[PDB]
Design an enzyme around this catalytic site. Structure first.
Site, PDB file in Angstrom:
ATOM      1  N   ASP A 120       1.381   3.614   7.971  1.00 30.91           N
ATOM      2  CA  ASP A 120       0.289   2.730   7.608  1.00 30.91           C
ATOM      3  C   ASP A 120       0.777   1.369   7.144  1.00 30.91           C
ATOM      4  O   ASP A 120       1.138   1.179   5.984  1.00 30.91           O
ATOM      5  CB  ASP A 120      -0.605   3.362   6.536  1.00 30.91           C
ATOM      6  CG  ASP A 120      -1.953   2.657   6.418  1.00 30.91           C
ATOM      7  OD1 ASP A 120      -2.047   1.476   6.813  1.00 30.91           O
ATOM      8  OD2 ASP A 120      -2.919   3.288   5.934  1.00 30.91           O
ATOM      9  N   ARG A 162      -0.251   9.047   0.338  1.00 26.56           N
ATOM     10  CA  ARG A 162      -1.143   9.234   1.483  1.00 26.56           C
ATOM     11  C   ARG A 162      -0.687   8.440   2.714  1.00 26.56           C
ATOM     12  O   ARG A 162      -1.121   8.716   3.829  1.00 26.56           O
ATOM     13  CB  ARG A 162      -2.581   8.853   1.115  1.00 26.56           C
ATOM     14  CG  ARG A 162      -2.728   7.405   0.734  1.00 26.56           C
ATOM     15  CD  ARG A 162      -4.149   7.068   0.261  1.00 26.56           C
ATOM     16  NE  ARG A 162      -4.228   5.657  -0.105  1.00 26.56           N
ATOM     17  CZ  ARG A 162      -3.811   5.188  -1.275  1.00 26.56           C
ATOM     18  NH1 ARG A 162      -3.309   6.032  -2.156  1.00 26.56           N
ATOM     19  NH2 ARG A 162      -3.883   3.890  -1.566  1.00 26.56           N
ATOM     20  N   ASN A 163       0.174   7.450   2.507  1.00 26.81           N
ATOM     21  CA  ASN A 163       0.649   6.597   3.591  1.00 26.81           C
ATOM     22  C   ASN A 163       2.057   6.960   4.034  1.00 26.81           C
ATOM     23  O   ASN A 163       2.683   6.243   4.816  1.00 26.81           O
ATOM     24  CB  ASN A 163       0.552   5.120   3.187  1.00 26.81           C
ATOM     25  CG  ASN A 163      -0.891   4.641   3.101  1.00 26.81           C
ATOM     26  OD1 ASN A 163      -1.758   5.164   3.796  1.00 26.81           O
ATOM     27  ND2 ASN A 163      -1.157   3.665   2.237  1.00 26.81           N
ATOM     28  N   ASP A 218       0.843  -1.195   0.000  1.00 22.15           N
ATOM     29  CA  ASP A 218       0.000   0.000   0.000  1.00 22.15           C
ATOM     30  C   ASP A 218       0.878   1.245   0.000  1.00 22.15           C
ATOM     31  O   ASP A 218       0.573   2.241   0.664  1.00 22.15           O
ATOM     32  CB  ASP A 218      -0.945  -0.013   1.213  1.00 22.15           C
ATOM     33  CG  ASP A 218      -2.122   0.944   1.063  1.00 22.15           C
ATOM     34  OD1 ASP A 218      -2.420   1.378  -0.068  1.00 22.15           O
ATOM     35  OD2 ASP A 218      -2.760   1.255   2.093  1.00 22.15           O
TER      36      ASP A 218
HETATM   37  C1  LIG Z   1      -0.489   7.406   7.520  1.00 20.60           C
HETATM   38  C2  LIG Z   1      -0.715   7.189   9.003  1.00 20.60           C
HETATM   39  C3  LIG Z   1      -2.075   7.744   9.421  1.00 20.60           C
HETATM   40  C4  LIG Z   1      -2.316   7.639  10.928  1.00 20.60           C
HETATM   41  N1  LIG Z   1      -1.228   8.283  11.669  1.00 20.60           N
HETATM   42  C5  LIG Z   1      -0.261   7.862  12.534  1.00 20.60           C
HETATM   43  C6  LIG Z   1      -0.162   6.405  12.862  1.00 20.60           C
HETATM   44  C7  LIG Z   1       0.084   5.499  11.833  1.00 20.60           C
HETATM   45  C8  LIG Z   1       0.142   4.137  12.103  1.00 20.60           C
HETATM   46  C9  LIG Z   1      -0.051   3.671  13.403  1.00 20.60           C
HETATM   47  C10 LIG Z   1      -0.313   4.573  14.432  1.00 20.60           C
HETATM   48  C11 LIG Z   1      -0.373   5.940  14.161  1.00 20.60           C
HETATM   49  C12 LIG Z   1      -0.650   6.891  15.305  1.00 20.60           C
HETATM   50  C13 LIG Z   1       0.531   8.972  12.976  1.00 20.60           C
HETATM   51  N2  LIG Z   1      -0.083  10.048  12.333  1.00 20.60           N
HETATM   52  C14 LIG Z   1      -0.006  11.414  12.155  1.00 20.60           C
HETATM   53  C15 LIG Z   1       0.827  12.417  12.657  1.00 20.60           C
HETATM   54  O1  LIG Z   1       1.767  12.197  13.438  1.00 20.60           O
HETATM   55  N3  LIG Z   1       0.579  13.693  12.257  1.00 20.60           N
HETATM   56  C16 LIG Z   1      -0.434  13.996  11.395  1.00 20.60           C
HETATM   57  O2  LIG Z   1      -0.627  15.190  11.049  1.00 20.60           O
HETATM   58  N4  LIG Z   1      -1.237  13.037  10.909  1.00 20.60           N
HETATM   59  C17 LIG Z   1      -2.333  13.356   9.981  1.00 20.60           C
HETATM   60  C18 LIG Z   1      -1.033  11.771  11.278  1.00 20.60           C
HETATM   61  N5  LIG Z   1      -1.762  10.666  10.878  1.00 20.60           N
HETATM   62  C19 LIG Z   1      -1.106   9.647  11.576  1.00 20.60           C
END
Ligand SMILES: CCCCn1c(-c2ccccc2C)cn2c3c(=O)[nH]c(=O)n(C)c3nc12
Length: 275
Positions: free
Chosen positions: A156, A142-143, A138
């Site tokens: 992700d 976006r990931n 994937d």
């Molecule tokens: C593409 C990953 C999407 C989910 N994810 C994560 C994340 C990703 C995987 C496992 C656990 C977590 C907390 C950190 N963050 C962050 C971050 O540190 N800062 C952000 O601005 N965003 C939108 C995030 N989105 C995530």
């Protein structure tokens, strides 16, 4: 899960705000106090109230994978909270969010060298991931998350497995589920296109069946506006029909390291799809 993910004490976690929506619950920002007393900013994924036992296993399953990687270009797992509720996955905080949404806000505002730095990080992360025997499946802008210093990191791991988004998937993986590190290299080629296109959607809104048929026929995404020839050639190399002819991630990192060192070479500039 605790094999590769330390259990964190919830009294050391403070939630600040909600910054995203996940498959399994919200994504929040906050702070974690480490055993050393140092306080760091973290991202926190929460498991929705009322989860099934299956959702819990799928949710935590991602942490088990992420936890096996310790690399500057793979998102760092700080740990998990399972002994209290809500159940959480805690990672390092990435100030600038997902790469695709970030670049969309800054169309044509970065130098080629900056974009190459981003791409090199992603490639280095993928080199480690493939070295460890994982296929991501994937790999898409976006990931990828990006921090305040523009460092990019693979995140992700929901689809990843030890050795599906059609637009990012190699033709052989689409055709008969042949997923290898070479199929991830195909995906990396798409990410490279996304970056150089400042977050344009691969194949725009083409129907899925046409993305599949067109790529199979030999058509490829065209050069993004003002794209260095060397970077477009790298896309094409990543998109070779024969997977054995695609570069390995180590070769990609090496290519990008040369372009960073010789910013001059980037001066040669290169149907909707090209045959
Ligand atoms: C593409 C990953 C999407 C989910 N994810 C994560 C994340 C990703 C995987 C496992 C656990 C977590 C907390 C950190 N963050 C962050 C971050 O540190 N800062 C952000 O601005 N965003 C939108 C995030 N989105 C995530």
């Amino acid at each position: 899960v605790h094999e590769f993910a330390k259990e964190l004490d919830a009294t050391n976690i403070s939630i600040d705000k909600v910054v995203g929506a996940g498959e399994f619950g919200e994504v929040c920002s906050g702070r974690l106090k480490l055993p050393s007393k140092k306080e760091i900013s973290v991202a926190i994924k929460t498991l929705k109230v009322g989860y099934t036992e299956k959702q819990r296993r799928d949710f935590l399953g991602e942490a088990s994978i992420m936890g096996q990687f310790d690399h500057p270009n793979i998102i760092r797992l700080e740990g998990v909270v399972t002994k209290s509720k809500p159940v959480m996955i805690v990672t390092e905080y990435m100030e600038n969010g997902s790469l695709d949404s970030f670049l969309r806000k800054h169309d044509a505002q970065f130098t080629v060298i900056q974009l190459v730095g981003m791409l090199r990080g992603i490639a280095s992360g993928m080199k480690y991931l493939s070295d460890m025997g994982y296929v991501h499946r994937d790999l898409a802008a976006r990931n990828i998350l990006i921090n305040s210093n523009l460092v990019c990191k693979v995140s992700d791991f929901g689809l990843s497995r030890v050795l599906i988004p059609i637009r990012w998937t190699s033709p052989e993986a689409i055709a008969y589920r042949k997923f290898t590190s070479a199929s991830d290299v195909w995906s990396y080629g798409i990410v490279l296109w996304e970056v150089m296109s400042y977050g344009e959607r691969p194949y725009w809104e083409m129907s899925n069946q046409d993305v599949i048929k067109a790529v199979d026929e030999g058509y490829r995404l065209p050069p993004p506006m003002d794209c260095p020839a060397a970077l477009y050639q790298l896309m094409l190399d990543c998109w070779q029909k024969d997977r054995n002819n695609r570069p390995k991630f180590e070769q990609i990192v090496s290519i990008l390291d040369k372009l960073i060192r010789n910013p001059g070479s980037l001066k040669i500039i290169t149907s909707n799809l090209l045959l």
